[PDB]
Amino acid sequence: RIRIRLKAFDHRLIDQATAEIVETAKRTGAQVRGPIPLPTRKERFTVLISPHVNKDARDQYEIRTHLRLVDIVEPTEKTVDALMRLDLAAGVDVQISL
Amino acid sequence: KKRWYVVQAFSGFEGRVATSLREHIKLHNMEDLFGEVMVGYVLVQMVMNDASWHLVRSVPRVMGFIGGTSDRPAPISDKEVDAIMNRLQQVGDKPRPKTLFEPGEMVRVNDGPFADFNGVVEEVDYEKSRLKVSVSIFGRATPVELDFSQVEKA
Amino acid sequence: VPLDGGRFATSDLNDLYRRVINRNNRLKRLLDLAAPDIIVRNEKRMLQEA
Amino acid sequence: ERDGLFCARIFGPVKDYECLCGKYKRLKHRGVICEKCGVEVTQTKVRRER
DNA sequence: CCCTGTCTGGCGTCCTCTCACCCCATG
DNA sequence: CATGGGTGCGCCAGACAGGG
């Protein structure tokens, strides 16, 4: 009933953090849809490295941001507070749309 | 000419009082002395003879008329009778939850688990009657949808 | 507090306060959409007696 | 009741230092209004004087 | 106004020990 | 399931009429 869309840069972190966000829900709400991954946005910035001439030495960079969905089933007040108010993992965005 | 009067019944048996009143009229056949019966108070179109007064108070589960005195009870001092019907109909049709959370306006939450929290309405939906406002939970503004009445304009 | 069975044996003051609040809510409703004088005189009189 | 003869915000929490249900189940923040429901955060005899 | 009759209120011992039973009713 | 509305006590005493 409530879309839980959460974003973070590390994949071993965003996917660790999705294990407890349903463990704090299935303990009380006892019904979640399931962990849905989403296609990651890879932003590339390839740019020069020398402070002058030699525009042939560049270094390819990439910042990968990931997205996960769990889309919890039950809108019972107990479950609502156990997710909305209880947000964990600093450095991990989580945004909810009921 | 038949003027209106107010009858008090045992509150809860009011439809049965109205039916028994119509039946007592058609028993004691004073048909020219009663016009209607409107529905804890029962409105009666009536005239005032002491016979019809004893008739209405001999109807069962009826306490008595409500007026200035019990000798000559009082017709209808309309002060807000029309206002009653008007406001009842208006509310029944629809309420008046003025879109409190407007696009780009801070709001206040007093309902659900987000009660006692403030936030801003990033998006508004007048068609869906829902305001998109996020409430700083553990610092993280938790974008949640609240109704106009569920939140107050800040 | 309830009794052995479980039904709550309620005090008399809760009946008195609950009556006064029921009548006061009815009288406020008889101030918004409201109703004629005889109605609000009986309503305020029932509140006075309550 | 939410706001009845036996309220939470108007008087106090039934349980000692417990706000209401899921809020404050230890001894650190005695006073915060439970985000879920309007309620005071005090002892058990606080309602007897209020 | 000065006495006379009426009308309502206020009150009547202290400790204990069991028992029984606490709002229908219903569209 | 919500809510909604008897007729056996007797004295004292002072306030309220009621004559007087």
UniProtKB/Swiss-Prot annotation, chain A:
Record-annotated disulphide pairs: none
Pfam families from the UniProt entry: Ribosomal_S10
Record-level Gene Ontology MF annotations: structural constituent of ribosome; transcription antitermination factor activity, RNA binding; tRNA binding
Any one GO cellular component localisation term in the record: cytosol
Highest taxon, organism lineage: Bacteria
Keywords for the protein's UniProt record, in alphabetical order: Ribonucleoprotein, Ribosomal protein, Ribosome biogenesis, RNA-binding, Transcription, Transcription antitermination, Transcription regulation
Protein's GO biological process: cytoplasmic translation; regulation of DNA-templated transcription elongation; ribosome biogenesis; transcription antitermination
Subunit structure, interactors included: Part of the 30S ribosomal subunit. Can also form a heterodimer with the transcription antitermination protein NusB. Binding of S10 to NusB is mutually exclusive with its incorporation into the ribosome. The rRNA transcription and antitermination complex (rrnTAC) consists of RNAP, NusA, NusB, NusE (this protein), NusG, SubB, ribosomal protein S4, DNA and precursor rRNA; S4 is more flexible than other subunits.
Role summary: Involved in the binding of tRNA to the ribosomes. Part of the processive rRNA transcription and antitermination complex (rrnTAC). The complex forms an RNA-chaperone ring around the RNA exit tunnel of RNA polymerase (RNAP). It supports rapid transcription and antitermination of rRNA operons, cotranscriptional rRNA folding, and annealing of distal rRNA regions to allow correct ribosome biogenesis. In complex with NusB is involved in the regulation of ribosomal RNA (rRNA) biosynthesis by transcriptional antitermination.
Family: Belongs to the universal ribosomal protein uS10 family.
Name recorded for this polypeptide: Small ribosomal subunit protein uS10
UniProt lineage: Bacteria, Pseudomonadati, Pseudomonadota, Gammaproteobacteria, Enterobacterales
Annotated gene: rpsJ
UniProtKB/Swiss-Prot annotation, chain B:
SUPFAM superfamilies, per the entry: N-utilization substance G protein NusG, N-terminal domain, Translation proteins SH3-like domain
SMART domains, per database record: KOW, NGN
Domain of life the protein comes from: Bacteria
Transcription in keyword set: yes
InterPro entries in alphabetical order: KOW, NGN, NGN-like_dom, NGN_dom_sf, NusG-like, Rib_uL2_dom2, Transcrpt_antiterm_NusG, Transcrpt_antiterm_NusG_bac_CS
Record GO biological process: DNA-templated transcription termination; regulation of DNA-templated transcription elongation; ribosome biogenesis; transcription antitermination; transcription elongation-coupled chromatin remodeling
One GO cellular component term: transcription elongation factor complex
The keyword Hydrolase is assigned to this record: no
KOW domain sequence ranges: 103-134
Keyword terms, alphabetized: Ribosome biogenesis, Transcription, Transcription antitermination, Transcription regulation, Transcription termination
Disulfide bonds: none
NCBIfam families, sorted: nusG
Annotated function: Part of the processive rRNA transcription and antitermination complex (rrnTAC). The complex forms an RNA-chaperone ring around the RNA exit tunnel of RNA polymerase (RNAP). It supports rapid transcription and antitermination of rRNA operons, cotranscriptional rRNA folding, and annealing of distal rRNA regions to allow correct ribosome biogenesis. Participates in transcription elongation, termination and antitermination. In the absence of Rho, increases the rate of transcription elongation by the RNAP, probably by partially suppressing pausing.
Subunit structure: Monomer. Interacts with the transcription termination factor Rho and with RNAP. One NusG monomer forms a stable complex with a Rho hexamer. Binds directly, but weakly, to the core enzyme of RNAP. Also interacts with RpsJ (NusE). The rRNA transcription and antitermination complex (rrnTAC) consists of RNAP, NusA, NusB, NusE (rpsJ), NusG, SubB, ribosomal protein S4, DNA and precursor rRNA; S4 is more flexible than other subunits.
Family (UniProt): Belongs to the NusG family.
Protein name: Transcription termination/antitermination protein NusG
Curated annotation (Swiss-Prot), chain D:
Signal peptide: none
Technological use: Co-administration of salinamide and rifampicin or salinamide and myxopyronin suppresses the emergence of resistance to both antibiotics.
Binding-site list for Zn(2+) 1: C19, C21, C34, C37
Modification after translation: Acetylated on several lysine residues in the presence of glucose.
Annotated function: DNA-dependent RNA polymerase (RNAP) catalyzes the transcription of DNA into RNA using the four ribonucleoside triphosphates as substrates. Resistance to the antibiotics salinamide A, salinamide B, rifampicin, streptolydigin, CBR703, myxopyronin, and lipiarmycin can result from mutations in this protein.
Family: Belongs to the RNA polymerase beta' chain family.
Record's subunit section: The RNAP catalytic core consists of 2 alpha, 1 beta, 1 beta' and 1 omega subunit. When a sigma factor is associated with the core the holoenzyme is formed, which can initiate transcription. The rRNA transcription and antitermination complex (rrnTAC) consists of RNAP, NusA, NusB, NusE (rpsJ), NusG, SubB, ribosomal protein S4, DNA and precursor rRNA; S4 is more flexible than other subunits.
Descriptive protein name: DNA-directed RNA polymerase subunit beta'
Residue span relative to the full protein: 52 to 101 of 1407
